[PDB]
């Protein structure tokens, strides 16, 4: 096979990153670990805090939008009822 263009990701042994030195990682076999606890006592009061920060970024836009819809939605309802058959005939055509 022929060569190919230079990508920004190789493969095991030459992944294309910076030379690493001084970093030492340690890990233990999943077999020597407690039969999957974590949640409740350690990672139960840690969760949801990961949507306490973000919450305002979603909520406000969702707020602004739900209000806008609900609001103009009520105006439709009014316009197409006796109470607004006059307002309607005005703002229609």
């Amino acid at each position: 096979g022929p060569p190919s263009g230079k990508t920004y990701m190789g493969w095991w042994g030459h992944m294309g990153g910076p030379k690493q030195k001084g970093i030492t990682s340690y890990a233990v076999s999943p077999y020597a670990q407690k039969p999957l606890q974590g949640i409740f006592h350690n990672a139960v009061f840690n969760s949801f805090r990961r949507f306490k920060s973000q919450f305002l970024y979603v909520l406000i836009p969702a707020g602004i939008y739900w209000y806008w819809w609900k609001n103009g939605n009520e105006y439709n309802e009014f316009l197409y009822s006796k109470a607004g058959r006059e307002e309607l005939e005005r703002v229609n055509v």
């Binding site: 095991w12 042994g13 992944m15 030379k19 030195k21 233990v28 076999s29 077999y31």
Partner: protein, 430 residues
């Protein structure tokens, strides 16, 4: 054969075989495994004062040679001499372990000794990668347990150590009950036992050393990745068998099956090892060696290796582990036979060496645990007994689908995750 052992006030053991010189030395049943994270490297620190220039000249004039050894399970201080000067030795051993237990530790010598091992250990961690990786293999395989302490001791706990620590250790460990004086070379048994019983006394008799907590294995890994290194050294093992174990030899024979290999030495590539077919097609590594490290509490069975083929490490491990799988399901008869012949061979060259300082370290360590040395002839009897069936049972307990310890340094980006390697410990079945 020989090997004789007698008590007194202390316990003595000798093995004489008329050769050249003869060495006598005190071997203590405590070592690296009896240290703490913060006092670690104290024994390696004693080893260097005993071998200090100050003490070395005192024995050199007298015509003696000093040899010290620091291990996990034990410690040893040995003095070599001519066959006749067998008394010149004991008068030095005793002078340094009784009279000079106030000298030597004198500043100007301790500071000189300490600055020298602090460099000695700094050289080791910067250069001797294979042994460093192995040291870390113990470090993680037995982490937070006695066996996890590196013999040379850490570089930090070392520079915090002062004379007091040396003394405290000596007073707590160098004791009558936790010691064995040995004599190998050509010196007779009755010559030593009496020369020792000449000057009576005890020196801290009736005193026992502080005990601890039994060493244990843990499936884990430590990856000291260094991309600036030209190779990738890696060691990998499982929980082995401790000395004085039913399978002490069965386990040692299994390692001999896969043995050792040097890709550059023509004869090595011709060996009768099935694995060598898989590893030579794309030259997966420069070398590798299988071992069966045994100790008092536990052990490590696995292999070490160095490789320049950094992009195919995953296959080195793959093939190597697929072979280990064979010991549980398909190890052939001739594979076992070949192992015996080669086990006996390398086992013999170990015991039958032309250097008593080796023989001493072998006699001491054994009698310091089982209280007697197993005759080489007795070993061969056990080795030849071992059947294919034996190897499989051992592999079924020790090797098949068991946790593992991994350690590596250099370009190890290609060494896949723990779980990937761990998986290869077995094979699919119906």
């Amino acid at each position: 054969a020989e090997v004789t052992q007698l008590s007194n006030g202390i316990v003595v053991a000798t093995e004489h075989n008329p050769a050249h010189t003869a060495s006598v030395g005190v071997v203590f049943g405590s070592g690296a495994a009896n240290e703490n994270p913060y006092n670690n490297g104290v024994s390696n620190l004693w080893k260097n004062i005993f071998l200090s220039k100050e003490n070395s000249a005192v024995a050199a004039k007298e015509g003696l040679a000093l040899s010290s050894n620091i291990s996990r399970d034990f410690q040893s201080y040995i003095v070599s001499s001519l066959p006749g000067s067998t008394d010149k030795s004991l008068d030095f051993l005793n002078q340094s372990f009784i009279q000079q237990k106030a000298n030597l530790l004198s500043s100007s010598n301790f500071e000189a000794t300490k600055k020298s091992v602090l460099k000695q250990v700094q050289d080791f961690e910067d250069n001797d990668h294979p042994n460093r990786v192995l040291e870390h293999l113990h470090s993680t395989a037995f982490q937070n347990t006695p066996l996890s302490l590196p013999t040379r001791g850490t570089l930090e706990s070392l520079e915090n150590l002062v004379v007091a620590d040396l003394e405290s250790f000596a007073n707590n460990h160098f004791l009558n009950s936790n010691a064995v004086v040995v004599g190998t070379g050509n010196i007779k048994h009755e010559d030593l036992v009496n020369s020792i019983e000449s000057k009576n006394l005890s020196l801290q008799t009736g005193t026992k050393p502080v005990l601890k907590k039994k060493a244990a294995f843990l499936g884990s890994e430590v990856r000291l990745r260094d991309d600036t290194l030209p190779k990738a050294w890696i060691s990998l093992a499982v929980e082995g068998e401790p000395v004085n174990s039913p399978n002490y030899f069965v386990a040692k024979l299994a390692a001999q099956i896969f043995g050792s290999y040097n890709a550059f030495e023509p004869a090595s590539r011709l060996q009768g090892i099935k694995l060598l077919d898989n590893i030579q097609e794309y030259q997966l590594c420069d070398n590798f060696n299988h071992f069966s490290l045994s100790y008092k509490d536990s052990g490590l069975w696995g292999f070490s290796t160095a490789t320049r083929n950094v992009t195919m490490i995953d296959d080195l491990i793959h093939f190597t582990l697929k072979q280990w799988n064979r010991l549980t399901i398909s190890v052939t008869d001739t594979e076992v036979e070949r192992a015996k012949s080669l086990l006996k061979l390398q086992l013999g060259q170990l015991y039958e060496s032309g250097n008593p300082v080796n023989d001493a370290n072998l006699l001491g360590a054994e009698v310091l645990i089982k209280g007697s040395k197993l005759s080489l002839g007795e070993a061969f009897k056990k080795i030849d007994a071992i059947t294919v069936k034996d190897v499989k049972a051992w592999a079924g307990k020790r090797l098949w689908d068991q946790d593992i310890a991994i350690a590596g340094t250099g370009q190890i980006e290609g060494l896949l995750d723990y779980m990937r390697i761990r998986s290869d410990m077995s094979m699919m079945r119906w």
